Design a protein around this motif. Structure first.
Motif, short mmCIF file in Angstrom:
data_model
loop_
_atom_site.label_atom_id
_atom_site.label_comp_id
_atom_site.label_asym_id
_atom_site.label_seq_id
_atom_site.Cartn_x
_atom_site.Cartn_y
_atom_site.Cartn_z
N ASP A 155 54.00 40.85 49.59
CA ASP A 155 53.67 42.14 49.00
C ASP A 155 52.46 42.03 48.08
N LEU A 156 52.32 40.91 47.37
CA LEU A 156 51.17 40.73 46.49
C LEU A 156 49.88 40.66 47.29
N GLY A 157 49.90 40.00 48.45
CA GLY A 157 48.72 39.95 49.28
C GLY A 157 48.32 41.31 49.81
N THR A 158 49.31 42.12 50.19
CA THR A 158 49.01 43.48 50.63
C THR A 158 48.48 44.33 49.48
N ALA A 159 48.93 44.07 48.25
CA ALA A 159 48.45 44.83 47.10
C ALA A 159 46.96 44.63 46.88
N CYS A 160 46.41 43.50 47.31
CA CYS A 160 44.99 43.23 47.22
C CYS A 160 44.24 43.62 48.49
N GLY A 161 44.90 44.31 49.42
CA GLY A 161 44.26 44.66 50.67
C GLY A 161 43.94 43.47 51.53
N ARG A 162 44.88 42.54 51.67
CA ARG A 162 44.66 41.31 52.42
C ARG A 162 45.74 41.17 53.48
N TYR A 163 45.39 40.51 54.57
CA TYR A 163 46.29 40.35 55.71
C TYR A 163 46.98 38.99 55.72
N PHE A 164 46.78 38.18 54.69
CA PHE A 164 47.57 36.99 54.45
C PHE A 164 48.40 37.19 53.19
N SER A 165 49.11 36.14 52.79
CA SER A 165 49.99 36.18 51.63
C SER A 165 49.35 35.44 50.47
N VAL A 166 49.53 35.97 49.26
CA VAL A 166 48.98 35.39 48.05
C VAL A 166 50.12 35.11 47.09
N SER A 167 50.22 33.86 46.63
CA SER A 167 51.28 33.47 45.72
C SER A 167 50.88 33.62 44.26
N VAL A 168 49.68 33.18 43.90
CA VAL A 168 49.15 33.32 42.55
C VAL A 168 47.76 33.95 42.64
N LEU A 169 47.36 34.61 41.56
CA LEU A 169 46.13 35.39 41.55
C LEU A 169 45.54 35.37 40.15
N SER A 170 44.22 35.22 40.06
CA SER A 170 43.51 35.21 38.80
C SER A 170 42.45 36.29 38.78
N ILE A 171 42.29 36.93 37.63
CA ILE A 171 41.31 38.00 37.44
C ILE A 171 40.17 37.43 36.60
N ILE A 172 39.01 37.25 37.23
CA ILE A 172 37.83 36.82 36.48
C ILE A 172 37.32 37.94 35.59
N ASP A 173 37.32 39.17 36.10
CA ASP A 173 36.92 40.33 35.31
C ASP A 173 37.52 41.58 35.93
N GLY A 174 37.98 42.49 35.08
CA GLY A 174 38.50 43.76 35.56
C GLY A 174 37.40 44.78 35.71
N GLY A 175 37.16 45.23 36.94
CA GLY A 175 36.07 46.14 37.21
C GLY A 175 36.17 47.46 36.47
N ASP A 176 37.14 48.29 36.85
CA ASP A 176 37.32 49.60 36.26
C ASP A 176 38.75 49.85 35.79
N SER A 177 39.65 48.90 35.97
CA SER A 177 41.06 49.10 35.69
C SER A 177 41.36 48.79 34.22
N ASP A 178 42.65 48.77 33.87
CA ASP A 178 43.09 48.44 32.53
C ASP A 178 44.05 47.25 32.55
N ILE A 179 43.97 46.41 33.58
CA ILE A 179 44.88 45.27 33.70
C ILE A 179 44.72 44.34 32.51
N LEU A 180 43.48 44.04 32.13
CA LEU A 180 43.21 43.14 31.03
C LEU A 180 43.50 43.81 29.69
#
Length: 96
Positions: free
Chosen positions: A71-96
RNA sequence: UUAACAAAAGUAAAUUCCACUGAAAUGAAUCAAUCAGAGAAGUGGAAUUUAUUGGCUUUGUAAGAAAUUCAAUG
């Protein structure tokens, strides 16, 4: 409450820069590029424990994603699976 | 034509791991399949198996043996 971060990781794909993969996530925590770490709900408890201990040393927030790596991989618009994820910079969101 | 046991000029096939890097315009691959962000393909490496050492050729053994001829042992 997974109608939030899912939409938050949609502007990052458009404008921000993230990196997918446990090995590549650990690379950024070693440097200063990591600003947030997202961990899926099914990451192995031993590899998860190494990310958090690294993040505690690096003072980088860890967000426990409420879905599996599929589900995390799909959340990033990807067709594989992602276990861990790092944000170098938040473009327009408020995640950081 | 060449043994057991050993040597290491030259050089194979297959599988599994390691380092660099991070795949989407998705790639890679088999007769079939099958595999990949808990990480593909690429490059460079390590290991094991292949009727004994290390699989094949080669070498010591070992030509002095043996086989095929000639002469009256060579």
């Amino acid at each position: 409450t997974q109608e939030g971060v899912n939409s938050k990781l949609a502007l990052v794909t458009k404008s921000g820069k993230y990196v997918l993969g446990t090995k590549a996530t650990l690379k950024t925590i070693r440097d200063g590029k990591s600003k947030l770490v997202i961990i899926s709900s099914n990451c192995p408890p031993l590899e998860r424990a190494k990310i958090e201990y690294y993040a505690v040393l690096g003072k980088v927030q860890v967000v426990h994603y409420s879905g599996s790596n599929v589900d995390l991989g799909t959340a990033c618009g990807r067709y594989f699976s992602v276990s861990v994820l790092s944000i170098i910079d938040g473009g327009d969101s408020d995640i950081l």
